[PDB]
Amino acid sequence: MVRGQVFDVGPRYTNLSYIGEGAYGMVCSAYDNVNKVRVAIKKISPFEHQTYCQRTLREIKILLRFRHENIIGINDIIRAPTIEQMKDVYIVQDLMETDLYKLLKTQHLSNDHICYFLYQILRGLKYIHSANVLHRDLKPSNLLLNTTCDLKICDFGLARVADPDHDHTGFLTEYVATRWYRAPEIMLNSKGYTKSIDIWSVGCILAEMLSNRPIFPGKHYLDQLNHILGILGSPSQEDLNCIINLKARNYLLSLPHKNKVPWNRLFPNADSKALDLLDKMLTFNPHKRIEVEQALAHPYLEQYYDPSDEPIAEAPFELDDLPKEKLKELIFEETARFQPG
Numbered sequence: 576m577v578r579g580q581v582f583d584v585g586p587r588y589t590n591l592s593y594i595g596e597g598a599y600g601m602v603c604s605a606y607d608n609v610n611k612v613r614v615a616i617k618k619i620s621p622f623e624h625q626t627y628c629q630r631t632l633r634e635i636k637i638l639l640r641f642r643h644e645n646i647i648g649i650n651d652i653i654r655a656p657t658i659e660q661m662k663d664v665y666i667v668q669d670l671m672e673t674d675l676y677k678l679l680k681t682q683h684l685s686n687d688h689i690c691y692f693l694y695q696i697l698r699g700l701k702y703i704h705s706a707n708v709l710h711r712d713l714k715p716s717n718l719l720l721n722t723t724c725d726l727k728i729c730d731f732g733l734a735r736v737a738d739p740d741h742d743h744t745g746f747l748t749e750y751v752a753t754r755w756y757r758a759p760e761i762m763l764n765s766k767g768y769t770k771s772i773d774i775w776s777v778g779c780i781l782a783e784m785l786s787n788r789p790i791f792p793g794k795h796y797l798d799q800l801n802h803i804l805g806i807l808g809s810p811s812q813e814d815l816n817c818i819i820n821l822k823a824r825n826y827l828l829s830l831p832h833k834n835k836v837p838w839n840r841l842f843p844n845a846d847s848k849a850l851d852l853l854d855k856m857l858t859f860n861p862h863k864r865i866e867v868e869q870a871l872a873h874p875y876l877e878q879y880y881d882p883s884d885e886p887i888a889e890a891p892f893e894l895d896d897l898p899k900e901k902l903k904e905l906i907f908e909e910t911a912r913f914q915p916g
């Protein structure tokens with residue numbers, strides 16, 4: 576029991592402390608009596624809802640398949656021994672001192688810290704993209720950090736397999752990513768099924784590391800594009816011609832001309848190489864946006880870049896029509912390897 580509710584992690588995990596509430600529910604630290612270290616445990620209660628089943632299953636499947644130093648692992652999964660008795664699932668992960676959201680609320684980052692954090696983000700993202708997966712919700716709170724500034728990407732509940740042939744859609748229809756980290760094309764003509772969607776989010780995170788403030792702090796869904804265009808300025812004729820959908824194109828054409836705000840005026844103390852990479856990640860046109868391997872090779876990251884130590888997935892990667900009964904059964908099968916049974 577923690578703060579009124581059951582938090583039932585068997586005798587293996589004891590001495591619980593509340594960490595906080597996340598996008599799944601309660602998160603605690605606990606002492607792992609087998610490995611003799613404190614661990615993080617998140618309690619998930621998805622089974623009444625098909626969407627929460629979908630996201631819980633996506634995450635478990637992805638994180639059990641992935642193995643990478645900059646991607647949070649699953650150490651253990653606790654649930655009841657039978658489907659009938661299973662109401663909650665607990666996922667045990669490495670304990671990490673903080674996250675980049677909490678860190679940016681109170682700490683100025685040195686240029687060497689921004690450089691190292693950005694390197695680790697892209698190194699992890701390289702592996703994710705190499706598996707043909709899109710994270711689709713990269714943001715500071717999904718970047719865990721320990722006391723020696725090792726970084727691990729978490730939350731794969733909103734991830735998808737990339738599908739660029741089916742990316743196109745209409746105007747003001749799509750809802751991918753968290754608002755401040757959402758690429759302009761999401762509001763214009765994209766379902767968020769290409770790798771470029773994650774690179775935009777990384778760009779936003781880089782900008783936020785430079786000033787401790789979100790770069791495009793849209794106050795609601797419709798406001799987000801105002802902030803993006805307010806800094807990038809009006810898209811070029813070529814970039815507009817890439818938007819074939821008329822509602823999206825004519826919306827952009829209806830706007831008064833806006834000049835680009837130079838990065839060096841917004842970030843007068845930033846490393847000029849960091850601003851060059853920032854510009855390339857926050858490119859309006861997703862086809863011209865830098866890719867993860869290009870980003871790693873950028874002069875800003877030259878102290879760290881080493882492609883032989885930037886591994887790829889061995890094994891690159893249909894839940895929407897599945898009823899929740901079947902997704903419970905799939906979660907039960909996927910978590911069976913952690914049972915004493």
Ligand SMILES: *CCC(=O)NCc1ccc2[nH]ncc2c1
Pocket residue numbers: 594597602615617647668669670671672673716717718719728729730
């Ligand atoms: C991806 C966001 C998230 O799951 N935050 C909660 C969390 C997860 C893992 C962890 N390890 N140490 C602290 C935490 C917090």
